[PDB]
């Protein structure tokens, strides 16, 4: 080979045939959460257990 | 290439094929709540049990 080379540089890859290193260190992480709720109570009550002689009609 | 490259600045992507390094860190959290109530009690009595000679008649 002829070709120029640097002397300080730090030797990265160039050409077709350049090696290179590769570190993977990946970490992906994703997270996803969703809630709902809806609570609906009723009761009503309404007795006499004694009415009025006045009021007995009703 | 032929294209002019500065060499103090910090190397930011500026053309159709420059790449760029993406730090997802999303991180979304809302919420929401909500709430009524209402409540009504009553209660009424009312009783001789005696009931005096002239008060028989009411
Ligand atoms: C937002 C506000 C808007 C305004 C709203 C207006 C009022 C909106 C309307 C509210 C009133 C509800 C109407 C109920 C009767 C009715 O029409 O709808 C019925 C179906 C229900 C539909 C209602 C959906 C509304 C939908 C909701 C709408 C809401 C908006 C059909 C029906 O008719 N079913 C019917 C049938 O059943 P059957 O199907 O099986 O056959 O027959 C059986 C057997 O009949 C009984 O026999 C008895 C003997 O056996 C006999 O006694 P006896 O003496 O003879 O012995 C006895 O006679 C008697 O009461 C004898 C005598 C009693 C006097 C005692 C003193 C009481 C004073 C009491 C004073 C009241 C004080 C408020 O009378 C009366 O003078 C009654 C008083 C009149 C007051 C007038 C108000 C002046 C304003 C005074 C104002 C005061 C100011 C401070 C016989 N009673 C009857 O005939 C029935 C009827 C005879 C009508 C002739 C009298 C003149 C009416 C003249 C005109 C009336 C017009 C309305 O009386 C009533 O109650 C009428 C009540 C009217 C109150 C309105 C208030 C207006 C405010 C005005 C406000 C604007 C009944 O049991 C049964 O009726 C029953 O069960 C009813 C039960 O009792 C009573 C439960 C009440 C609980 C509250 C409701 C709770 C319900 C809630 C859930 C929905
Ligand atoms: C906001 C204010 C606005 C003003 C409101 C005005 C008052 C608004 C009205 C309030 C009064 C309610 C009227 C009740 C009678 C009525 O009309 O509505 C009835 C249906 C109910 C509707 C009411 C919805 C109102 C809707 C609400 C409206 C509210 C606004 C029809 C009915 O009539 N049903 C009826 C029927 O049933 P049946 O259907 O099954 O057949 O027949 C059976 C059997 O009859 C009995 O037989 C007995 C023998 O067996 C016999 O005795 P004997 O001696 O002979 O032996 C006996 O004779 C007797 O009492 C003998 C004698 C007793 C004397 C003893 C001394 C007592 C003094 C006591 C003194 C009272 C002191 C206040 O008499 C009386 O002089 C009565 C006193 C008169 C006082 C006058 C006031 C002067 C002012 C004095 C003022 C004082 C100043 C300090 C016979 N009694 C009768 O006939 C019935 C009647 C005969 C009437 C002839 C007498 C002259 C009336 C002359 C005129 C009256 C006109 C009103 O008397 C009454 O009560 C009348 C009470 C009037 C009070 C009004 C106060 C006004 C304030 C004035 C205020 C402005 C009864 O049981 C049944 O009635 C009963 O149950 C009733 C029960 O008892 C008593 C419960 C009372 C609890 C409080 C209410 C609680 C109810 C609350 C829930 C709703």
Redesign the pocket.
Known sequence: NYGYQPLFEDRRPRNIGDTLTIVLQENVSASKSSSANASRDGKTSFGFDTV??????L
Do not use: A, N, S, V
Not at 52 to 57: E, F, T, V
């Open positions: 009025p002689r006045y009021l007995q009609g």
